[PDB]
Each structure stands twice: as structure tokens, then as C-alpha cells.
Design a protein around this ligand. Structure first.
Ligand SMILES: [Cl-]
Ligand SMILES: [Cl-]
Length: 162
């Protein structure tokens, strides 16, 4: 398993504009288009991202292309972030993927916000970090996904995804 396969499981794939768990317009593999309520505004962001008149539909390759860009951006964003980078550097390969997943979902700022959990992770106090990560809006809103990521930080294996 790897980051791409993990995220593809968490996000799924939809080739037509849809609303995310928060009611925001998205497409592909979790690619947010806009937080605006307007479907036009979403179509417009979509065509600009794809570079063609899409009419709200994209092909699989186009979705995969946004996905690759988005996983890259998340990695680079973690590495540029003063609060995230040291955590990322202290982790093993599996757990690094869990951190990337969270940033992909909630953005670098949102994640940087979990100050207490970040320190626990950096200290390698797995069980404690898992308990702390669970006291969050994140966990209460998308519990099954949150559980899978949490379990990954707890175990350092991909079992939650098996
Ligand atoms: Cl984009
Ligand atoms: Cl969920």
C-alpha cells in the first residue's frame, strides 16, 4: 500500500462535480473546487484547473492528474511548514503517509493546529497521540476515516486499510 492507494480508498473517485462531506463542490479524488455555494463558480474553477471547457465532467486521467498534483502539493506543503516538517522528519514511512492524508484532507493549517497531538507523535507516544487525535471535530465528523488514519499512527502498519 502507499499514499496514493490509501488516499484513493479514503476519497473514492467521482468524475462529475459532487458535494463533499461538508457540502463543498469537489471532483475526482477529493479535489476541492470551491467553498462557494454556486455550481457555476465550481464549474468555472473546474475548467480553469483542467484547462478546457468541461461542463462539470472530467475523464479518469484528468482526475488522476489533479490527484498527483494534490499529493505533491501536500508533501511540499508539509516540508515547508515550520510546525509540520519536524514531525514528518521524525516519523517512519507508514506514519508519514498518515500525516500526508490528514494534510490532504484538512490542509496544512488545520493540521498544524493539532499542537498537542503533533508533539505526542514526535515523542513516539502512539497510544496517547491516538487518544488525543480523537478529541477533534475531525473525528466526530468523519469517524470511519479518522479511525483508519488514527489506527495507522497507532500501529505504524497498513492494517486499517486491509
Ligand atoms: Cl488546481
Ligand atoms: Cl468517515
Amino acid at each position: 500500500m502507499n499514499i496514493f492507494e490509501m488516499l484513493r480508498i479514503d476519497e473514492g473517485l467521482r468524475l462529475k462535480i459532487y458535494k463533499d462531506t461538508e457540502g463543498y463542490y469537489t471532483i475526482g479524488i477529493g479535489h476541492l473546487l470551491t467553498k462557494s455555494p454556486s455550481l457555476n463558480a465550481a464549474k468555472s474553477e473546474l475548467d480553469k484547473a483542467i484547462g478546457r471547457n468541461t461542463n462539470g465532467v472530467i475523464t479518469k486521467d484528468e482526475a488522476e492528474k489533479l490527484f498527483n498534483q494534490d499529493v505533491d502539493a501536500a508533501v511540499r506543503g508539509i516540508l515547508r511548514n515550520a510546525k509540520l516538517k519536524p514531525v514528518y522528519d521524525s516519523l517512519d514511512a507508514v506514519r508519514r503517509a498518515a500525516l500526508i492524508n490528514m494534510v490532504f484532507q484538512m490542509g496544512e493549517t488545520g493540521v498544524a493546529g493539532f499542537t498537542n497531538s503533533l508533539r505526542m507523535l514526535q515523542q513516539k507516544r502512539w497510544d496517547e497521540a491516538a487518544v488525543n487525535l480523537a478529541k477533534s471535530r475531525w473525528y466526530n465528523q468523519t469517524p470511519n476515516r479518522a479511525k483508519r488514519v488514527i489506527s495507522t499512527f497507532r500501529t505504524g502498519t497498513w492494517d486499517a486499510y486491509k
